[PDB]
Amino acid sequence: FDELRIGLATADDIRQWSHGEVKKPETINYRTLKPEKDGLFCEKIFGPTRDWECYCGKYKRVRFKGIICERCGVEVTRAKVRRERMGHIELAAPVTHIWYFKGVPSRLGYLLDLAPKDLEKVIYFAAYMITFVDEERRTRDLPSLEAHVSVERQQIEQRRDSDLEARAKKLETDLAELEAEGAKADVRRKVREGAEREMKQLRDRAQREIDRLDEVWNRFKNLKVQDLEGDELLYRELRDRFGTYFDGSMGAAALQKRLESFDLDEEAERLREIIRTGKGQKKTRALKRLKVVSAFLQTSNSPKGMVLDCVPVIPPDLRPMVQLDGGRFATSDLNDLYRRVINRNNRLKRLLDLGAPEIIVNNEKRMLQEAVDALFDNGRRGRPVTGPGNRPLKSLSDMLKGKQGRFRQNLLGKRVDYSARSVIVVGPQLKLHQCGLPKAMALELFKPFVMKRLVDLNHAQNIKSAKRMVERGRTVVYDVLEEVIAEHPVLLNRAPTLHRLGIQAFEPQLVEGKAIQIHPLVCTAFNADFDGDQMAVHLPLSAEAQAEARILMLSSNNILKPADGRPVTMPTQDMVLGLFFLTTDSEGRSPKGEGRAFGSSAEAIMAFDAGDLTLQAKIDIRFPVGTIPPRGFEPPAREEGEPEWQQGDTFTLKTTLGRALFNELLPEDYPFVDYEVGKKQLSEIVNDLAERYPKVIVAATLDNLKAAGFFWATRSGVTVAISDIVVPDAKKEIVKGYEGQDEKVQKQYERGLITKEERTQELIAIWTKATNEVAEAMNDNFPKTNPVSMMVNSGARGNMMQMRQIAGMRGLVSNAKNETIPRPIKASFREGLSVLEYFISTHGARKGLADTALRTADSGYLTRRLVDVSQDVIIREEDCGTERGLKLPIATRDADGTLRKAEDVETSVYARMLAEDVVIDGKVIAPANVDLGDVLIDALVAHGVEEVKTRSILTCESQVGTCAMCYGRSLATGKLVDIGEAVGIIAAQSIGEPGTQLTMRTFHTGGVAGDDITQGLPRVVELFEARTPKGVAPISEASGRVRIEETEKTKKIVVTPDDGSDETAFPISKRARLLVGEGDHVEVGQKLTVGATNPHDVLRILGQRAVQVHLVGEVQKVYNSQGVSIHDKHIEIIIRQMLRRVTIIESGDAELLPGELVERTKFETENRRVVQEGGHPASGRPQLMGITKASLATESWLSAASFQETTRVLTDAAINAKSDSLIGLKENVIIGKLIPAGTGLSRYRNIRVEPTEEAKAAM
DNA sequence: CCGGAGCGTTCAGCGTTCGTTTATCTCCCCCTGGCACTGTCATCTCCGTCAGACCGTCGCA
DNA sequence: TGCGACGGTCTGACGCTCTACACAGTGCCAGGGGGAGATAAACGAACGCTGAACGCTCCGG
């Protein structure tokens, strides 16, 4: 389990694994249903089908286990041994493996210098091959064979001359006799014409016999190894004419005979020689050939296994034939493929037994080879073997691949026991850490524990009686159930589970109904909505699992979302509206009892219950001792003649009753919050509470906030009648004026003075102006009292666009294929659309639905790719010895006379760590190795700093992984990241979580294609794939003079760098936009055409820091366009995992291949060991590569096998004979060992616990 | 005042009879072998992916 | 050889579950070797049968 090897399995290994020969094709008997002898499903080879029974019906008893039956040879043992015992099929003629031959040429490898079409010709029995030639023996006796050929030519010419003389005599004789007989007037001309026709035909066959002799001579003269011969007649006449000189064969046996004598070390030698000198695509050919051949040199596995003689068989359980109801049978397609191979092998053996024609034997060997190929890969070549006539049979590989393969459907993700699922309901009566399971769910989940406690409580005599009562379901079972499930957490989980908070451990609690009762305060972190969403409940089982549920997983410890550090367990739908109504100012609502002193909040509550004081009214309310005053009230303390402090003393405040209640919700140590709460300030309050109070106190305060928010939202005066939604009264006249001027334009267009396109453009412009103006009128119309504004201005639920298109006009709405109708929807949803206006609304609606479906699909795909590329990076050191960092800006866009901090400081500089101390006047403002929060950043920007050096992960160098300090504080705990936290998966999920939340598509292309770059999720995936964007913006290599060259066929730009640097020319199309000055000043910074720069050349000509900044800035500017906030360290992790590979050149002294994928640490180690040897180091360039290519090119082939290309990497590992170290997480999920992240580390599992001496002395 | 016949238990003679095997006689099964006018090249997939690579191929320059 | 483009090749293409299902057109008989399965006999052992025999308490003239 330390190491998991792979390689080519030669026939010796197959025979070692095998336990017999599957000689016969049949599987089971047709009446007794017993497995056959020495055939498929054989009990002698694979093992018995029952337990400790044998085939011949004897030896049914268990006592004499491990013996061999004399009658039938079946070993008596368990029935599960048929899951692990394999045999083999002995093939009469060798066949090739379809994985290596007929694949990617990087894995075919050109090990023999043959074209793939030549292989198709040779091993599919359509063209011959010469396997061996006695070249030195052929060249030794050249004068003798030349003399024999000369003798043959001489006798050919002699017999031609004799035949010519005889034909001349015959022609003269017949001409003389037909001119002397005089049978006809011109019969001599006819016989002469016939004679000359005979002349030309016999001369033709003479030149033809000469031609075949010449062609066989020049064919034999240039015969060598690796020679093919398509024509069977030509090879036959070489065999007949010339003997024991060249050896050839037919089919895959030719490859075996070539490979047994194939000399490959000198092949690598001369191939290195042609690597050293040459030019062109020959370099690439020899490069791939040397990268494949050198695998067989260093490794000890012989290359014999590419062509095979034996075929191992799957054990019979894994290709079962199971009995069903009604007598029907169901078998796997592997049994059918094995049956086909066995039938054809038996028929080939039968043909080899007797004397058979070569065409029939060759066709039999071809169909055998094709059947073996179909067994290894059904559908790789040609029409797949269908079978029933509907679908192709699934081969071995066809279930090692894809969504139906073992890697992705049964190894990474598995079904589980002790799990349950039902719909969800909201329960406000629960705490933060409680969930309500039904009775049936809790009984079926906790059934074995219930039986154990029932036997312990002796309600049942033994286990069977306990099970009988549980199945019957008596009330004592429910009582002991309620006694059991407490102090036993369960894992709740939603199916999408987009991010880390999709699994949260609650404490179960018995409730009635058939639905899981769930705290509303946490349902937004699940993305849960109570509309039939079904949540599965998984049960942690051992002590370790429920301990990790209690400590790591509890719902009262997951306040802060790891995506941005913002609180996520304070939802907004209903409680925020209640607190808004509780704490808002009295505007538009009649304030009763406005401006009267109150002794305490109790007297105010009594007055409010009486009815003479409204909830929001500016009153002077005195507060008892211990209440902390507001942040703004401490300096404006009540004026004092003697020295006094208002910090712990009583005070009077000008605040409403509702704010006093709200500060009764918050803890006593919190300062009196004295403003409109809404949502954003509530998020800030919850963030401050989480940052400055322990977890249990924060859970209690949010539970109080939930309860009071619901209580006051019931009485908040929100409701939606149709009078509450109000249309602007000015909308009628605004629309009337705009349609009047539209009518004026329409009669203006009717005269043809303007085109249709210009009219459409100006019409959509003026109608956009109209909808913006009526939106402004709508904002100016509504008061603060109506509930729609009260639930949209409080951050509760809704945006201003929705209220704009319910009250005001719906505005402009798109057509099919992304254009705009000149006529907008002038009717509001309160007024109600007309027929066709509603039709054009449906145009946009269905496109939006299809867009969000495809968007969530591609978001899941990007999330998976990010998880693969960004995994196996884990915090593994406490601190580095480094001091280098990143120059992240802190103060930007300062005005005249003032300094302003950066706008995106909250996602970039926050939650990081300083690389070194900062000084402005010789004194440190912020110490090194501390987090950067609000107060410290405010102090720095007040002192007058412009940029800071943050110790980020891109500059982190370490012996293994990354350290905690260089990564920065974790955004999910609010503290420093613990050693072992799997930061890579958290980063990948945080990038992939708002993929469905982007909801972006290009509104209009402007009538031209290609002018607009990719937007939204396609832009993000194009950035992370390191691909060249669709809008390419070239960058000048050096500063110099740049001018345009407007060639008519294709535009052209030319930049001439100064200082004697070489001219570089960039090709640009005849497209509309180019922003560079002709004969103007240019440098490396700017871009010749506005567009997305290709980041490959950015890295090439600017540096690693510049390309890191560019990538981070681009993805963050995509994400910030929608409102989703992702911290930049999550991107920086993927970018660091992205630039790790380095491309090397001129590696003539570093003794490895130049111009491939080389790891950075390995390249540095090679440089160190070659400068230790004295040789000059090889050059190297960093290579920005995509997430997919970096995921495939990994050390552990199990992780790459679990990814997309699972056939290429398996063949690659088999050829390279690479064994993977099990450092990683996919390769530890598959095996079932503990993952090396978090609790699974070595430094945590190696603890020994013992009580102290005074502890055992006490008891 | 010990004798006797009757009664309880305990083993060896021969006499049949179960306990356990064997080859013989119907019945069915199963694999190989046999058909003697002539009748000598079928079969129908596969389209409104799909997106952009990734690649070697391959003819033109 | 460098060029494009033409081409084949190849891969996935968010997620469980309330739900969930099954699947079709062209020969025939005789002769012969195995093995299960019924028949009656047969080798071997013990299971009954013959009362007889060892030996006591026994009512007894």
Ligand SMILES: [Mg+2]
């Ligand atoms: Mg839902």
Ligand SMILES: [Zn+2]
């Ligand atoms: Zn047996």
Ligand SMILES: [Zn+2]
């Ligand atoms: Zn570090």
